[PDB]
Amino acid sequence: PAHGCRHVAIIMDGNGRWAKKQGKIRAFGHKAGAKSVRRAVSFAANNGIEALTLYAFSSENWNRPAQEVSALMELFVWALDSEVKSLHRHNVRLRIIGDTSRFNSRLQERIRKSEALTAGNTGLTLNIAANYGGRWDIVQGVRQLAEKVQQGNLQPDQIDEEMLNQHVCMHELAPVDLVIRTGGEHRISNFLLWQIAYAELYFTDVLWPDFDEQDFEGALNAFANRE
Amino acid sequence: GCRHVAIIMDGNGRWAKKQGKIRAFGHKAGAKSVRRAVSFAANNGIEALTLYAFSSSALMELFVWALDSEVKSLHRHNVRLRIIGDTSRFNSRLQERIRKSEALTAGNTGLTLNIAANYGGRWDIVQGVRQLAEKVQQGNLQPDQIDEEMLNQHVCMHELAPVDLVIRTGGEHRISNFLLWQIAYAELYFTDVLWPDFDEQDFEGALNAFANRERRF
Ligand SMILES: O=P(O)(O)C(O)(Cc1cccc(-c2cccc(-c3ccccc3)c2)c1)P(=O)(O)O
Ligand SMILES: O=P(O)(O)C(O)(Cc1cccc(-c2cccc(-c3ccccc3)c2)c1)P(=O)(O)O
Ligand SMILES: O=P(O)(O)C(O)(Cc1cccc(-c2cccc(-c3ccccc3)c2)c1)P(=O)(O)O
Ligand SMILES: O=P(O)(O)C(O)(Cc1cccc(-c2cccc(-c3ccccc3)c2)c1)P(=O)(O)O
Ligand SMILES: O=P(O)(O)C(O)(Cc1cccc(-c2cccc(-c3ccccc3)c2)c1)P(=O)(O)O
Numbered sequence: 001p002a003h004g005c006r007h008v009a010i011i012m013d014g015n016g017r018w019a020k021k022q023g024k025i026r027a028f029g030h031k032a033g034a035k036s037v038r039r040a041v042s043f044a045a046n047n048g049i050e051a052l053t054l055y056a057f058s059s060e061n062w063n064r065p066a067q068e069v070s071a072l073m074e075l076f077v078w079a080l081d082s083e084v085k086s087l088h089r090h091n092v093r094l095r096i097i098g099d100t101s102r103f104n105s106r107l108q109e110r111i112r113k114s115e116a117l118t119a120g121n122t123g124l125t126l127n128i129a130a131n132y133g134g135r136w137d138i139v140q141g142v143r144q145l146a147e148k149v150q151q152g153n154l155q156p157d158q159i160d161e162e163m164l165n166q167h168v169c170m171h172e173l174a175p176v177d178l179v180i181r182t183g184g185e186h187r188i189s190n191f192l193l194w195q196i197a198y199a200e201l202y203f204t205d206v207l208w209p210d211f212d213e214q215d216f217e218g219a220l221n222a223f224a225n226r227e
Numbered sequence: 228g229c230r231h232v233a234i235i236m237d238g239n240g241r242w243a244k245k246q247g248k249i250r251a252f253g254h255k256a257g258a259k260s261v262r263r264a265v266s267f268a269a270n271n272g273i274e275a276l277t278l279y280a281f282s283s284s285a286l287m288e289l290f291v292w293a294l295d296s297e298v299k300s301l302h303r304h305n306v307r308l309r310i311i312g313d314t315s316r317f318n319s320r321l322q323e324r325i326r327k328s329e330a331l332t333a334g335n336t337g338l339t340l341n342i343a344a345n346y347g348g349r350w351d352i353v354q355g356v357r358q359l360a361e362k363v364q365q366g367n368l369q370p371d372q373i374d375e376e377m378l379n380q381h382v383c384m385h386e387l388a389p390v391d392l393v394i395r396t397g398g399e400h401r402i403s404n405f406l407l408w409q410i411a412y413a414e415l416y417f418t419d420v421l422w423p424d425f426d427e428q429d430f431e432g433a434l435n436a437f438a439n440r441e442r443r444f
Contacts, residue, residue: 059444133375134411135375135378135379135408135411136375138352138378138408139373139374139375139378142356142359142373142378143370143371143373145356145360146359146360146363146368146370146373147370149360149363149364149370150363150364150369150370154360155364156357156360156361156363156364157357159353159356159357159360160353161347161349161350161353164349164352164353164356165349184443184444185440185444186414186415186416186440187412187413187414187415188410188411188412188413188415189411189412190411190412193407193408193410193411194349194352194407196402196407197348197349197402197403197404197407198401198402198403198404199401199402200400200401201400201401201402201415201417202400203415226399226400
């Protein structure tokens with residue numbers, strides 16, 4: 001399309017701050033945040049973007065017990081189940097990226113079903129990060145290579161970038177062209193690392209609930225002008 | 228408190244054009260700006276400064292010339308010099324100059340200055356991977372024992388403080404395959420100022436930005 005942007009990744013941040021300013025509790029920001037997600041996904045689908053990868057940055061996870069962080073992963077991806085039907089009806093291909101290996105088998109089956117169901121859709125490819133880390137991503141790929149070495153099928157010296165690239169999340173999709181981070185912080189926070197080696201980085205102070213189609217348009221135009 | 232700053236230096240040629248001068252003129256102004264950045268970092272308690280020359284045999288001799296004429300003063304200033312990158316294919320005289328310069332200064336306790344030469348963040352990670360694959364081949368390591376901490380011990384600069392701030396001059400908003408694994412939690416600061424003009428005030432503005440952002444976030 002005219003903006004020449006095939007794959008956009010977004011670090012969503014600012015929902016709690018947005019609620020706080022309103023005098024509302026965090027759950028109200030979660031709802032406004034969900035609504036801003038739906039709006040970003042329609043925008044991307046309507047603007048010919050091929051893939052949209054979303055990472056929810058939690059400013060609060062440092063105050064929550066580790067036991068709680070695992071459970072929230074439950075509800076989160078669980079919640080994203082009633083939503084699968086809607087994504088499918090909109091011709092979106094859903095993929096979950098992250099470490100879901102420790103997740104209960106019932107949910108892993110659900111994730112696989114969801115991905116299989118929407119795999120042949122021809123609209124936007126939507127990647128949702130769940131228990132995702134950039135370093136972990138690189139490490140799970142390294143492990144896959146470590147198994148081939150242990151099998152006898154790979155010589156350490158044959159490992160190059162191109163080969164490690166085939167084993168990181170989203171390698172079958174267009175490289176990430178643009179990473180947007182809302183909320184004001186200027187860090188990647190262990191979101192994508194290997195995949196953003198050549199991506200344009202766009203930071204905006206706008207809080208996620210307020211980030212709308214015109215903000216997304218501004219980012220794509222900055223990208224178009226910058227490339 | 229900012230301990231390790233990484234800078235993507237960019238804008239020398241654009242600067243020269245604006246001045247109506249030739250490329251060599253921007254290179255010269257660029258080198259002076261490198262000296263001023265290093266002095267500044269050393270004078271302000273920064274533990275490590277990592278520099279990457281962004282560009283879209285003669286440079287090899289210049290590299291030798293640069294090491295031969297600057298290493299003594301860096302040594303006197305208690306700077307520890309390290310070159311990061313794939314120098315495996317540089318001519319052996321240059322490889323030897325690099326090795327001696329690093330050896331001469333290895334024990335200094337002031338600023339560690341890392342100069343990227345033929346460096347790439349993906350290559351960096353891949354060299355660490357090869358190291359681990361070797362131990363797997365031998366039999367000293369099981370695939371499933373490989374974790375983040377471990378690969379971290381095999382990527383460049385693992386013995387130094389974590390990179391706190393990455394500064395990129397010149398106007399582009401990309402990492403361009405500079406550090407990747409190492410910038411997971413770093414503050415990213417972009418400025419349109421061209422490298423020859425990047426000065427103490429610009430450097431301080433990035434440091435202040437880092438400090439303020441550390442307070443608010
Ligand atoms: O609602 P909160 O954030 O006030 C709290 O109950 C934690 C929590 C409870 C229920 C639901 C959620 C929730 C709802 C929607 C999204 C998310 C979320 C999405 C992505 C990353 C982190 C969190 C979490 C969080 P907390 O224990 O942190 O006070
Ligand atoms: O399908 P369209 O292009 O006709 C339209 O629904 C826009 C749209 C496109 C793709 C996805 C969505 C959409 C709608 C409802 C929910 C979601 C959704 C987004 C993220 C997670 C879960 C669900 C996405 C809407 P429109 O607003 O243009 O009529
Ligand atoms: O913005 P924060 O860091 O203040 C916070 O809302 C976490 C958060 C960040 C970004 C997005 C979301 C969020 C909230 C609700 C739904 C979703 C969502 C994500 C993906 C698909 C569909 C819905 C994401 C939550 P927190 O729970 O840590 O207060
Ligand atoms: O800024 P550019 O991309 O326009 C260009 O000057 C390349 C370049 C970028 C950044 C720094 C330098 C450069 C020039 C002179 C000296 C140094 C230098 C680097 C490290 C230690 C000492 C000196 C770096 C060159 P180019 O040769 O590609 O026109
Ligand atoms: O100064 P010049 O224009 O006479 C010439 O040496 C080019 C040149 C001189 C000095 C520095 C550089 C240069 C360009 C790009 C990168 C670097 C560099 C410097 C330090 C580390 C890594 C890379 C240096 C190029 P030339 O190739 O035109 O003979």
